[model samples]
Target: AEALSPEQAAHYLRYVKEAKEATKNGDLEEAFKLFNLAKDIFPNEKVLSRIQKIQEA
Candidate 1:
């Protein structure tokens, strides 16, 4: 959490990127899970709000 490893960044990016793909593919609910998976690695407020947006929209 305190350090930024390239590997960790790539893992998180994959989640965010593919999660967006899932959204485009009409899978917002599952995308939330992917964002949550990314959250485990980053704990990002962006992902939290994104999840809420997905749920609400």
Candidate 2:
């Protein structure tokens, strides 16, 4: 994958943080949504892995 622009990286990180918090809180649906938002911004294995984990849950 190509490197993300600084602004894109920052935005993606924000969603990642939200996703993690949602997952920690047992809000799987919300976590999935947040992860998808990040994925849309920048497709990455890390985000794909997280989405898979949430889907499996």
Candidate 3:
């Protein structure tokens, strides 16, 4: 991956925060969407784990 810009970091954070909120709210579908958005920007093992967990749910 290339160097991460501040704008991209903020964008990723937005999706991550939204994904966590959606997960907390018991909205797996929405959480999945947001998680995927964040993952697209910056893939991480923890995020993939959450996606797997949500999929199992």
Candidate 4:
């Protein structure tokens, strides 16, 4: 992975926040989409849980 920077950090945060909003809205589709973007940024358990969340539902 490249060096971690503020841009990447904020970019990840942005997607996570958007993802949560989507989930809160009960729009799993959008939430999944946002999570995918976050995965590209860097896969993590938080994102996995969200992805798992919709699948579980």
Candidate 5:
């Protein structure tokens, strides 16, 4: 996979982190939505892995 530009990576990380926090707070809908947005920017393995964990939860 190609590396993301700094801006792209940062933006994606921001949303992913927000989504994880949302999930932890029992806001699965917002978490999933943010995850989808993050996915659009960069489908990294770590993000996908975290999504799988959330789905399982």
Candidate 6:
């Protein structure tokens, strides 16, 4: 996410927020897609691990 410009980071943050909300709501597909998008922008191992654990769950 640090690699993103301010605007890009803001734009992507929305998706990250939505992904969290979706995950909370048990909408795995939506969360997964948003996770992938966010990852493409800035891959974080910690975040990736969280997503992988969710998938495994």
Between candidates 2 and 5, name the one with more favorable lDDT. Answer: 2
Candidate achieving the largest TM-score: 3
Error of 6 at 12 (Å): 2.2
List lDDT for all candidates, in order: 0.84, 0.87, 0.86, 0.83, 0.82, 0.77
What tens-digit string does per-residue lDDT give for candidate 3 at 1-57? 598889989999999999999988999888898888888889989887774553433
- Score candidate 1 by TM-score against the native: 0.76
Put down candidate 5 lDDT per residue, 1-57, tens digits, no spaces. Answer: 677799998989899999989988998788888888898998777666655544544
Using lDDT as the yardstick, the better of models 4 and 5 is: 4
C-alpha RMSD in Å of predicted model 5 compared with the true structure? 3.4
Query: How would you encode candidate 2's per-residue C-alpha lDDT over 1-57 as one tens digit per residue?
Result: 577799998989999999999989999888999999999998889889974553433
Deviation of model 3 at 6, angstroms:
0.7
For 1-57, candidate 4 gives per-residue lDDT tens digits of 588788888988999999999988989888899898888887888687764653543
Error of 4 at 24 (Å): 0.6
Task: Write the residue-wise lDDT of candidate 1 on 1-57 in tens digits.
Answer: 289789989999999999889889988877888998898888867887774553333
- State how far residue 13 of model 5 sits from its true place (Å): 0.6
- Candidate 3, residue 43: Cα displacement in angstroms equals 0.4
lDDT value, candidate 5, whole model: 0.82
Where model 5 places Cα greater than 4 Å from the true spot, the runs are: 1-3, 49-57
Evaluate residue 17 in candidate 5 and report its C-alpha lDDT on the 0 to 100 scale: 92
Estimate, for each residue in 1-57, the C-alpha lDDT of model 6 and write its tens digit.
155688778767887899899989988888889888887776788558655544344
Q: Which stretches of candidate 2 lie over 4 Å from their true place?
A: 1-3, 53-57
Better of 2 and 5 by TM-score: 2
Candidate 4 global CA lDDT score = 0.83
- Candidate 3: TM-score? 0.84
